[model samples]
Target: GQHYLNSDGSRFVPKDFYPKFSWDTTPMYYMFGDTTRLLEPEEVEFIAERTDFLCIEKSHGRTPLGAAELGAKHEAAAFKKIKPDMKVLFYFNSAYAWPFTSYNQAFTRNKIDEHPKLKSFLIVDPKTAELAHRRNVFFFDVLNPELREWWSTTVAKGVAESGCDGAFIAQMHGFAWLRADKSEDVQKAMGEMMALLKRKMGPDKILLGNNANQDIAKDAFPVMDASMFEHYNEKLLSKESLLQDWDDMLRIAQAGKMSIFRIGVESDPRDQPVLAKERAEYYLACYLIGAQPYSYFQYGWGWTLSSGSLHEFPELRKALGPPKGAYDRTTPDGWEFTREFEHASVWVNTETGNAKITWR
Candidate 1:
């Protein structure tokens, strides 16, 4: 099980520490988004009074360094306000080389994409004999050792300079585009890059992988200390799919890994709005049914601070003790589930996305 060794031949240990909460079973939320929103004084107070973890995404200001500087400003403000141990995360894509940071200034300000020397850093479309891109952002050739080192080094710089407790590694699924023959090599490179990130960031800092629990990025789970279910929507609201996701939370928790169960509201395209109170209870109940220690529930239509981050839930304020045991199937077809906690009882019909929590 000890796949990697330490400097003195000791077994390497991954980071397992998380922000501690006195009432471990009480429903908690994970907040992440624009620095501009988080920098607001009221937002800082909201974070201090509401959530335990935050991931500052790539937004605002002139360059990537500026974004991280704002992140540190929020971190300092949050620490000064309340919850000194509150964890803030710096965000960076694992595959795309976005031209936002000081490290990648050549990509934007200097036009690194046009350079012949660094052309090998970008992935190319064999058919077109040209570089491949998604969402107008260039993908990094993970197989390039120099590029990998640069990526990991910049991540270290972002976290250290921003004063964040950890780093959020996004877009891990992008490596799925590698050719069949090169897939093995890319996987190896991915593992090596993660190791390099861990080394550069030090063992104490957290590395949270986005979509790590999904099938496309399963290999990333071994190296990341935490995982995010970035998209939990209507498509994944089925009984079978929800059960699998619930199991994921349990397994990740059992392994001492942190989990963020982000559930988004499903609404008509014409009018987008926050889930009503009853609807919010349904999602919250679904979360409570399978939640484990350090598994925080996030409800938002989007990642921005205005996207339900300030939405309050009465259930979250009530006392919640640890679950008595795993949830029980209350129906023969397995559409209904019930789980009890020391101070609350949870019931949900996954088929209807309807649920209720009876506070004791």
Candidate 2:
């Protein structure tokens, strides 16, 4: 389960959750901080053994290459130890379109001038678009075919050079480029980009799109390796709502798609209590759906200074407890049942609108 951050900067796991008669191993916790602090071999083993999948943010505050290299190293070490054949997903920020603004325009101009090869491929917001009014400044527009081509090529070159297995593309189609009026153009551009990437890297390389809803990428779905839902809407984390989203994604994956998405990262300590159970349910849902691969979000440290961070409520620690692991019919319509991996089984009966489960 998720742990809250204490005043001492360490994670606080509720002691009550552990029964006196339970297992003896110390409950493991992860503390996010500078990559340099990740030198201990024991820490690596701890993370590898407990975590179902690792989603690493390879970019930190504008350091893309540096972050990617460090993430690769950590992933390499962890993979060697656990040998669980766990999956790793790397995130690339800054590579996306810059927010619209005079400052951003100037910065984009400078980057294009400095890195000519990056100019055509850079993602930007198109000027004269109504969606432009919603942003501060438009830097690169992925809606443009030329720009999408550039982006696909640039990413392919980067991944090939870095030896990364795959990448999670954040803010893929959630920007100004995805307005209702521009939907057709956006879809075309995105499809072009996906086709270009597949051509360059081959079909085996992983490509996960972040925050792209079904309506936005109907045809593009077949090309996408996975899809992520923000879960920022409080509804998504609720017992009922989580299952709803899981069922939706499962149905999508069952059509012979690649992966089902869920987030494990929480910036605040308050949300940690739900992390383990939420993650377990998410993994089980993906398995039952037969999604080829699954990934979890941030594993390290983050601050609660902003609303986006998960550490907003200090009192959240008191609410933490061991998971009940119970699954009951929440509605009259039960769910149908299915299983792909032995770890998780699912029940889905549309008539009752319920699902039940037990873990091995």
| lDDT (tens digit, per residue) of candidate 1 on 147-214 | 88878998898888777877888876545555667776776677778778978997578888887787
TM-score result, candidate 1: 0.85
Model 2, residue 148: C-alpha shift (Å): 1.3
Candidate 2 TM-score, C-alpha based? 0.57
Candidate 2: C-alpha RMSD to true structure equals 11.9
Residues 1-360, candidate 2, lDDT per residue (tens digit)?
244322122333322311111111212212122333333565556555543334444332223224444545455445546754444554543234442211223334344456554454444344642223233333346566666666676566645554545555665453534356876776666666766775776544666665554565654566666566555444454546555655554454344333334434352223544553444333334223322212222222231212122232222112212222323343545344343223434554433334444443
The per-model lDDT (C-alpha) reads 0.69, 0.43
lDDT winner: 1
